[PDB]
Design a protein around this nucleic acid. Structure first.
Ligand SMILES: [K+]
Ligand SMILES: [K+]
Ligand SMILES: [Mg+2]
Ligand SMILES: [Mg+2]
Ligand SMILES: [Mg+2]
Ligand SMILES: [Mg+2]
Ligand SMILES: [Mg+2]
Ligand SMILES: [Mg+2]
Ligand SMILES: [Mg+2]
Ligand SMILES: [Mg+2]
Ligand SMILES: [Mg+2]
Ligand SMILES: [Mg+2]
Ligand SMILES: [Mg+2]
Ligand SMILES: [Mg+2]
Ligand SMILES: [Mg+2]
Ligand SMILES: [Mg+2]
Ligand SMILES: [Mg+2]
Ligand SMILES: [Mg+2]
Ligand SMILES: [Mg+2]
Ligand SMILES: [Mg+2]
Ligand SMILES: [Mg+2]
Ligand SMILES: [Mg+2]
Ligand SMILES: [Mg+2]
Ligand SMILES: [Mg+2]
Ligand SMILES: [Mg+2]
Ligand SMILES: [Mg+2]
Ligand SMILES: [Mg+2]
Ligand SMILES: [Mg+2]
Ligand SMILES: [Mg+2]
Ligand SMILES: [Mg+2]
Ligand SMILES: [Mg+2]
Ligand SMILES: [Mg+2]
Ligand SMILES: [Mg+2]
Ligand SMILES: [Mg+2]
Ligand SMILES: [Mg+2]
Ligand SMILES: [Mg+2]
Ligand SMILES: [Mg+2]
Ligand SMILES: [Mg+2]
Ligand SMILES: [Mg+2]
Ligand SMILES: [Mg+2]
Ligand SMILES: [Mg+2]
Ligand SMILES: [Mg+2]
Ligand SMILES: [Mg+2]
Ligand SMILES: [Mg+2]
Lengths: 213, 117, 169, 77, 112, 83, 109
RNA sequence: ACAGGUUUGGUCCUGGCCUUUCUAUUAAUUCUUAAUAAAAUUACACAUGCAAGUAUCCGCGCCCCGGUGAGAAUGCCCUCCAGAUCUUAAAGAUCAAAAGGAGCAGGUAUCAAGCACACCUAUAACGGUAGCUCAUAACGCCUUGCUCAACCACACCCCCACGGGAAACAGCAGUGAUAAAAAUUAAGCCAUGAACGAAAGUUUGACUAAGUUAUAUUAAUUAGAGUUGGUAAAUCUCGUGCCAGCCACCGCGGUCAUACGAUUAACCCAAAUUAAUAGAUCCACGGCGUAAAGAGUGUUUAAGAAAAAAAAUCACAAU
């Protein structure tokens, strides 16, 4: 839509450039963004208070970079586990780090972004994914002599059914249509529960988006 | 109205006067008001029993599976409503509420009889 | 209508009783005719009578007149794909041209009746809402159901005022 | 409803959340029901998705569409 | 095969008004519009710009216009397609013979 | 009321039959074959019934939700008596 | 008026009404400025009890007091309607009895 | 409109104003109860409380709902639609920016000319042409939310908001000022809707169920208001004496008033009645010798008619 009296507003575009310029120049650093007071459980930067379900793990554990700084090359090729998987999953779950770049703002070097290779329930992916939920105070590091103990895995086949009956009313319509069209076979319809595999909710999602394929 | 985002959703829209509710099963953008503009009206759901003791429900089955096929989200009550009809399996929260009713009723029966004796 | 030679042709019924619907590919109709000679009687009467009917049924089709440019009256149709349809009228009467036009480019009777049949399903009888778009406005307008409390007051046991009183007591 | 730029309240500025209790036996069964229920609905959602593809494909390049296209073209000539 | 246009008029026929500008002819399109009160049709004149590459436009012609797939400016959205009736030089489309109004310039019944 | 009791005359238009074809063959009105889970009496889905979780899973949940735990309950009653 | 002329001029549309002495508002509140007596035009002769007030919009206009007898004094608050008195030219407002500082007519006692 | 009252000593004609019908707000007089719908002075300044959280930290959401009609002739319908989001087998769908136009779109021409408003080449420069909109209303000015499952716009002001003035309830309730305009500083997330979580679930002044008010409709438990010369249903006895006063239009009162004020009686509506202001509706498909109306005359441009027939004039005082 348009009219013959359109006025060329310029301040709106001017504000957009300056606002975009300011945020790029004043982008908060990871050290100051995630710094936390361990008594009030309050975030000085965002002003957010952590939920009570996460209070215990903060004071009784360390994040990824706290256990990764004291390594020669920031632990490239090392295996890193997480307390969340250890408590709920008997099968071993770990990350094989590929590269890691911490931020120099922190005086103790306790922050940064890291990548790695995912191993969930003994299933290994063939691509590198950026590590999600790094700042969480639940990570742990496995020893060198225990590396092969956790790496060893026993493959257990899945016993879930591959087909389930249709819901009752929807089952009737399937029978009704084929009977109407002449298909009088009395074979019970089934649903292929094979393309509907659901990853567990604790599985980390891809931080990077997906481009056109 | 032009919204930033939102997902297509099938939900219940309230109607009728006070003390006489009446829900219309409608499919509209999630960011629009409850009684606001909608894409297509599917059915109806009368919450009060009539003289025959029936709560009437209407569903546009061929259209309902069309919107679900194109990626429409369902709210809590419509899933329970569809589950009763048999189009969908019984919602897990529908069963658990049933089980809670039995246990509360079982406690109620025992509590009344314990006081009796 | 009082003014004009034939006031009947300026009423809504006359504009609506002409049944000539062009296909979706017809865009421009050019009509050339003469103001003199007995041969142009069919062309002149077609312009004076049928053209208002044709345009009313085809609001998006341009109709342009040209007088005394060609000795032989004719009609020219321009399609969407650049196709040109030339219709020659030199002795055909008013009625003949309309029948001739209806067959070369008009729509079939089965196509028109099925088009409006699919239009009926838009206003589905099973829906509720405003009177302008739906038949009923509420479920209380259906016999047997609980009526609107405005007409018939509801029993006290169902009113929320009584429900809240006992819960607090 | 509030906006992004208005300040929050003062009284409710200390609390964050208070999750309810968890029944161990009931929670596990409820979680198991959801895992199968979501799986079943997803298969139906994909089945309906394939139905829409079939309907749209037939409306575009179905056999009846070619008959209709040829019939009008033949009549026009 | 995406060569559509966003305008509501794909093909229009109008009379040439003037050819003052360079390789562009301003034409006047005429359409019938129903007056709501009198229920009678009157002509409504609108001006269109058409791009003429060969400079073939003379004032007084009747020209068919074809919608341009991409506008060349804020006003030129149509391209000339053919000269339906050259001014003063009108050939009857039926008999393919030169004519001047009602009288035939050349007799169609005289091949030789 | 009088017109409803026939005491007074009023116009009655002639009305065509509701349906075009009178067929009871379709499965919407005719009885459909019972489901294999219907004749057996088993619930339509395995998870509709109540199943006792393994004790290992119960211990894991108790550790995870320790402190805010609630009293657990057994299988629900099959039939609810009347007060 | 032939067909073409009727088409060009369009259908006749009734002009909107002109605002009255009360500027379209049903009732206005004013402050009494002066009380005087106005006389009608023949063949009706009398002494009509009028008053001059300034309305809430700031304009100053002449008003009329219906009924017999009044106790209105300068700098009193009254309410004015939009009626008109036929006998008195110019006067186009009437004080509504029974509001603010003017009461109803007093029965003879 | 089924029309009625009113020009004149009197008739006909032409032509205004007003009565009779329905809806809303305020005010006067009056008032018993219940239910439902609705709640409306003010884009003026605002005390206090509340209106966005959820969640094993990340993240997501945070005028979305809601509020208002200030602004703009804005617009309606319609073509195309990037981009954002959801679903997934990466091609389907929801919302749709910008841009565009078959047509439709308030008043005013005592606003008649606007003053760069066009186009070509190649470049995305330079160079070249001298054009574009407009009496079918350009360019101006004034008034204004709307064509309603809804849409367009604003979010203290400087059309915008880097900045500046300056320190924000046009979120619910409430207050000051102002206006003829007068709802509770209340309860709950039980339902539905929205946000977040895998999930039990949490928040939610949106909403649900209530509080308040003859503003409307219904039922019943409830009785007062207006009018009584004519149009227009209906009265007598006194007082007053062109005085006090009455009227929607015509009019009444100048010591024998069915018109003022009171009384008796009657009429008409009824928990309402009457008055006031807006709105619905209402002018010409009718007229131009005498009534408002054929412009002092002729030709031509825009534009429109032609359709059957037929038509270059002429002693005399044109210039
Ligand atoms: K009259
Ligand atoms: K709730
Ligand atoms: Mg947060
Ligand atoms: Mg309601
Ligand atoms: Mg009066
Ligand atoms: Mg008078
Ligand atoms: Mg008072
Ligand atoms: Mg008062
Ligand atoms: Mg006279
Ligand atoms: Mg007289
Ligand atoms: Mg009041
Ligand atoms: Mg009430
Ligand atoms: Mg989580
Ligand atoms: Mg709104
Ligand atoms: Mg206002
Ligand atoms: Mg305004
Ligand atoms: Mg303006
Ligand atoms: Mg758009
Ligand atoms: Mg797109
Ligand atoms: Mg897409
Ligand atoms: Mg002037
Ligand atoms: Mg602003
Ligand atoms: Mg605010
Ligand atoms: Mg408020
Ligand atoms: Mg404010
Ligand atoms: Mg106040
Ligand atoms: Mg009010
Ligand atoms: Mg008060
Ligand atoms: Mg109080
Ligand atoms: Mg509360
Ligand atoms: Mg609670
Ligand atoms: Mg809830
Ligand atoms: Mg969710
Ligand atoms: Mg209420
Ligand atoms: Mg009285
Ligand atoms: Mg009186
Ligand atoms: Mg006397
Ligand atoms: Mg009278
Ligand atoms: Mg009297
Ligand atoms: Mg005259
Ligand atoms: Mg005259
Ligand atoms: Mg003249
Ligand atoms: Mg003249
Ligand atoms: Mg001409």
């Amino acid at each position: 839509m348009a009219r013959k009296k359109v006025r060329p507003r310029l301040i709106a575009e001017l504000a957009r450039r300056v606002r975009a310029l300011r945020e790029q120049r004043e982008r908060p650093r990871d050290s100051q963004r995630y710094a936390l007071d361990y008594e009030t459980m309050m975030r000085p930067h965002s002003g957010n208070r952590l939920p009570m379900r996460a209070w215990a793990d903060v004071r009784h554990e360390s994040r990824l970079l706290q256990l990764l700084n004291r390594l020669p090359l920031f632990g490239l090729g090392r295996l890193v586990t997480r307390k969340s998987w250890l408590w709920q999953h008997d099968e071993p779950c770990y990350w094989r780090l590929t590269r890691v770049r911490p931020d120099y703002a922190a005086e103790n070097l306790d922050h940064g972004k890291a990548w790695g290779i995912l191993t969930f329930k003994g299933k290994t992916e063939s691509e590198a994914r950026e590590i999600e939920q790094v700042m969480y105070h639940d990570w742990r590091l496995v020893p060198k002599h225990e590396e092969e103990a956790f790496t060893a895995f026993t493959l257990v086949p899945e016993d879930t059914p591959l087909s389930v009956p249709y819901p009752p009313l929807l089952r009737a319509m399937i029978l009704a249509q084929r009977q109407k069209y002449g298909d009088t076979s009395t074979e019970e319809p089934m649903l292929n529960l094979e393309r509907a595999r659901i990853d567990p909710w604790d599985y980390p999602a891809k931080l990077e988006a997906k481009t056109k394929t | 109205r032009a919204y930033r985002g939102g997902h297509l959703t099938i939900r219940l829209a309230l109607g009728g006067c006070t003390n006489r509710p009446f829900y219309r099963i409608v499919a509209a953008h999630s960011k629009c008001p409850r009684d606001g503009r909608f894409v297509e009206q599917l059915g109806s759901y009368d919450p009060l029993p009539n003289s025959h003791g029936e709560k009437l429900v209407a569903l546009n089955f061929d259209r309902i599976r069309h919107w679900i096929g194109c990626g429409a989200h369902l709210s809590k009550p419509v899933e329970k409503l569809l589950g009763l009809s048999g189009f969908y399996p019984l919602h897990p929260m529908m069963i658990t509420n049933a089980e809670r009713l039995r246990r509360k009723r079982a406690r109620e029966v025992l509590l009344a009889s314990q006081k009796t004796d | 209508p009082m003014k004009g030679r034939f006031p009947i042709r300026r009423t809504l019924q006359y504009l609506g009783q002409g049944d000539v619907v062009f296909k979706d590919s017809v865009k421009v109709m050019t009509v050339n005719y003469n103001t003199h000679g007995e041969l142009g009687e069919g062309a002149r009467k077609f312009v004076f009578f049928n053209i208002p009917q044709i345009q009313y049924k085809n609001p998006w089709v341009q109709i342009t007149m040209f007088k005394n440019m060609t000795p032989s009256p004719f009609l020219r149709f321009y399609l969407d794909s650049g196709e040109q349809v030339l219709v020659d009228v030199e002795s055909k009467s008013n009625k003949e041209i309309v029948e001739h036009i209806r067959k070369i480019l008009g729509k079939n009777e089965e196509t028109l009746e099925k088009e409006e049949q699919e239009k009926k399903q838009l206003s589905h009888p099973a829906h509720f809402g405003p009177r302008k778009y739906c038949l009923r406005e509420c479920m209380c307008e259906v016999e047997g159901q609980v009526p609107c409390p405005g007409l018939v007051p509801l029993p006290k046991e169902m009113t929320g005022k009584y429900k809240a009183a006992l819960k607090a007591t | 409803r509030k906006t992004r730029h208005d300040p929050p309240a003062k009284s409710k500025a200390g609390r964050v959340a208070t999750p309810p209790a968890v029944d161990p036996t009931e929670f596990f069964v409820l979680t198991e029901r959801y895992r199968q229920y979501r799986q079943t609905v997803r298969a139906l959602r994909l089945e309906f998705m394939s139905e829409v593809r079939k309907k749209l494909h037939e409306a575009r390049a179905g056999v009846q569409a070619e008959r209709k296209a040829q019939e009008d073209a033949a009549e026009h000539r | 095969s995406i060569a559509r246009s966003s305008v509501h008029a794909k093909w229009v026929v109008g009379k040439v008004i003037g050819t003052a500008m360079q390789k562009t002819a301003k034409v006047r399109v005429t359409r019938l519009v129903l007056d709501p009160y009198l229920l009678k049709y009157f002509n409504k004149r609108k001006t269109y710009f058409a791009h003429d590459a060969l400079q073939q436009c003379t004032v007084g012609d009747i020209v068919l216009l074809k919608a341009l797939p991409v506008p060349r400016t804020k006003h030129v959205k149509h391209e000339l397609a053919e000269i339906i009736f050259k001014v003063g030089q009108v050939i009857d489309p039926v008999t393919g013979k030169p004519c001047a109004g009602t009288t035939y310039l050349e007799s169609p019944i005289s091949p030789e | 009321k009088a017109r409803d009791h026939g005491l007074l005359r009023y116009h009655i238009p002639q009305v065509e039959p509701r349906d075009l074809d009178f067929s009871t063959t379709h499965g919407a009105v005719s009885s459909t074959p019972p489901a294999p889970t219907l004749v057996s009496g088993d619930p339509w889905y395995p998870w509709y019934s109540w199943k006792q979780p393994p004790e290992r899973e119960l211990s894991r949940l108790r550790r995870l939700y320790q402190g805010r735990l609630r009293e657990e309950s057994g299988p629900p009653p099959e039939l609810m008596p009347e007060v | 008026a032939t067909l073409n002329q009727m088409h060009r001029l369009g259908p006749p549309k009734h002009p909107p009404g002109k605002m009255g002495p009360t500027a379209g508002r049903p009732q206005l509140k004013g402050v009494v400025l002066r009380t005087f007596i106005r006389k009608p035009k023949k063949p009706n002769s009398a002494n009509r009890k009028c008053c001059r007030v300034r309305l809430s919009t700031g304009r100053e206009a002449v008003c009329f007091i219906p009924g017999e007898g009044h106790s209105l004094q300068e700098h009193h608050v009254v309410l004015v309607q939009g009626g008109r008195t036929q006998d008195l030219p110019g006067v186009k407002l009437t004080v509504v009895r029974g509001k603010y500082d003017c009461g109803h007519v007093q029965k003879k006692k």
